[PDB]
């Protein structure tokens, strides 16, 4: 017919990605209807750049989550090694999260193991620390923020070797103190373990999301 009218847009070439979206050139044809007998041709662009969607998910590689807490310091042949110069062992783990659609696995250790001495509930001589620096104002956004500092009854750690060779063959593994001991100090301000002072924060600005 005389009238020109564009047909539908369509890709020129296959989407140049194997997953997700990509950009491709697209085109359309003046054939809906075809101009004929000198009638006007379709006005406008015959081509454009445009998103193409494969609709196929891309691989997603796994990533480690954060390590969990160390397990209790223990030695497999013994009921309790607390408060003795006996290395035990301890471990913690983490999990590979998010792997999907043939993404890579997480590389590295799933479990971390170390040697340790247990001072869990051990009495130890204590001394009062000097004041810590003031902490953050808490709650940061809630009514009336306050910040704190502390003096702590700090235990004297027993003077064991920091490294030990478990095997006759040479090899000095670190050994780390683990557990909450029971430090002994005379009281300060009526307290045996922590003395704390607090101060309001002043002219607190509001928490507004910049967004």
């Amino acid at each position: 017919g005389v009238a020109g009218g564009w047909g539908p847009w369509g890709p020129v070439s296959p989407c140049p990605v194997t997953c997700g979206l990509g950009q491709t050139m697209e085109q359309r044809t003046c054939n809906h209807p075809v101009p004929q007998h000198g009638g006007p041709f379709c006005a406008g662009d015959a081509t454009r750049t445009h998103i193409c969607n494969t609709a196929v998910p891309c691989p997603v590689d796994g990533e480690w989550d954060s390590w969990g807490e160390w397990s209790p310091c223990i030695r497999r042949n013994m009921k309790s090694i607390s408060c003795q110069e006996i290395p035990g062992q301890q471990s913690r783990g983490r999990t590979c999260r998010g792997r999907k659609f043939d993404g890579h696995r997480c590389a590295g250790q799933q479990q971390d193991i170390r040697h340790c001495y247990s001072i869990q509930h051990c009495p130890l001589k204590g001394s009062w620390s000097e004041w810590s620096t003031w902490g953050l104002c808490m709650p940061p956004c809630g009514p009336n923020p306050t910040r704190a500092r502390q003096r702590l009854c700090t235990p004297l750690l027993p003077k064991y070797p920091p490294t030990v060779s478990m095997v006759e063959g040479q090899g000095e593994k670190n050994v780390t103190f683990w557990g909450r001991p029971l430090p002994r100090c005379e009281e300060l301000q009526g307290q045996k373990l922590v003395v704390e002072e607090k101060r309001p924060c002043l002219h607190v600005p509001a928490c507004k999301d910049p967004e």
Partner: nanobody
Amino acid sequence: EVQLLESGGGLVQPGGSLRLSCAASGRISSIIHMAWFRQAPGKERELVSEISRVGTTVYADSVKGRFTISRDNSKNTLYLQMNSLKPEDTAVYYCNALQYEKHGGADYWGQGTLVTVSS
């Protein structure tokens, strides 16, 4: 099924190098990733390095820059080139191949080869 056969383990001094090889056979077209794992004394087996069919790789932080994984498709072999070896790399090392999920998702394993690094 895919069968894997590793070789190349041995005893080396710190700072030395060794190359592990693994020949793959069977339905190798079903494999998306090939990898090396290792099992050190006292420890669970861990992934050291892996390489996808398209060529992307991942390495454990403890071996990054020191170990290099690679494939020779013309020989259907996978390699782990280890340089700057340290005593803590001592372990049995295992070749592994993982299928695409669309082909069943199976892991396949070699028999293991021992790498010992000692002064």
